[PDB]
Amino acid sequence: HMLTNLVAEPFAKLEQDFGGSIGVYAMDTGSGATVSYRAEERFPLCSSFKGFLAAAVLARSQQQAGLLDTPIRYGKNALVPWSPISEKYLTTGMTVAELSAAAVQYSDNAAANLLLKELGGPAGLTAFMRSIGDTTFRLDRWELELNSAIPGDARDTSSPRAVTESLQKLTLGSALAAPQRQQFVDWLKGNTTGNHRIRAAVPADWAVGDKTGTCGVYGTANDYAVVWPTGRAPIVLAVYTRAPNKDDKHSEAVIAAAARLALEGLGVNG
Numbered sequence: 001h002m003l004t005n006l007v008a009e010p011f012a013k014l015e016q017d018f019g020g021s022i023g024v025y026a027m028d029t030g031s032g033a034t035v036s037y038r039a040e041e042r043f044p045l046c047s048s049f050k051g052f053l054a055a056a057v058l059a060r061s062q063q064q065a066g067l068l069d070t071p072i073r074y075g076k077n078a079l080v081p082w083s084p085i086s087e088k089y090l091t092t093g094m095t096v097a098e099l100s101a102a103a104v105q106y107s108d109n110a111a112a113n114l115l116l117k118e119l120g121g122p123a124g125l126t127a128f129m130r131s132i133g134d135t136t137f138r139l140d141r142w143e144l145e146l147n148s149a150i151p152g153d154a155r156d157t158s159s160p161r162a163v164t165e166s167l168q169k170l171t172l173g174s175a176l177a178a179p180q181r182q183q184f185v186d187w188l189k190g191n192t193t194g195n196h197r198i199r200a201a202v203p204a205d206w207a208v209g210d211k212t213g214t215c216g217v218y219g220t221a222n223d224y225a226v227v228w229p230t231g232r233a234p235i236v237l238a239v240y241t242r243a244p245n246k247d248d249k250h251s252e253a254v255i256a257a258a259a260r261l262a263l264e265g266l267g268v269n270g
Contacts, residue, residue: 003033009261018254020219020243026262029172030229032234035265041242042136042157044149044220046213047107049125049156050140051224053115054100054187055170056128059179060119061096063204068097072114080143083110094095104187104211109143116142122156129166130173151244159164159263163224163238171209171226172234185209188226197223198239198258201263203270205229214250221250223259227269237262 015018015022031162061067073093079086085102086094087110094102099115100112102108122139129137129244140146140155148156169175171185187211202208202225224238239258254257 003031004036005265007265008266009035009037009265011258011261013184014254014257014261015219017025018219018243018251019248020241022254022258023160023240024238024262025164025265026034026235026237027164027168028233028235028245028266028268029168033245035262036098036161037162039161040159042149042154042159043222043242044213044215045139045156045158046147046149046220046222047112047217048163048211048213048224049146050103050107050112051188051211052105052129052137052147052166053112053119053125053178055099055184056119056125057096058176058184058188059128062177062180070096070099072096073241074110074114080113081110086110093198101187101190105191105193107193107212107214113143132166132169134162134166137166137167147215147217148216149218149242151218160238160240163240164236167224167226168236172236178227194223194225197255198225198227198259199238201259201270202227207226219245219248219250221252221255223255231267235263235266235268
């Protein structure tokens, strides 16, 4: 507590202008200082679960050395809306590693469902998260049903705090073996969908990896990231949004603005 919210930031004004709710957790891994706003509330994961999915695949590959190289064939019926990479390899197949990268870096929906099946479905991914000590995360459904984002529905949700804590364990801590840890980081660094979110608040000369989510309803969208500012320890953070009405629109600018406030609250000059 002593190191939480040392410097107040105007998150309430930001969410009121947005017309909804914003949840933020950010941790300076050097000192342990934190910024926290609505950090223990539940928000829909949307596609942000796909980062944790890829980490679970990497954990399994520690015991199955041939897993990442395994070629996966799939039919046209596997190709749900928003599958920009897997649609180009329908007639050839893709490896498990390639599906993982597509799920992370393009939010590919078909790739995510194929990998969920490999893990034993939503309960299997939830079990991996329990195994690293995350008691908040729950995945319940598959793509696209998990995007419904219904107000008050706990299915397919986590909290900004649990997301950040689990991201830290997987990218900087000991939850993955060292080669798998660096592969997870490298996939996050290569994400293509986050240029207008946390990355928009991060100077270009710092390294960063992230995973986004966009549910398409209830103003619900998000991003989480690891950030390496030069000359100091890394920062881990998560920014989640939602709104009361089904046709309320999400805002990328609001996510970038919340990330800027988080970095300011940690005293990180950007």
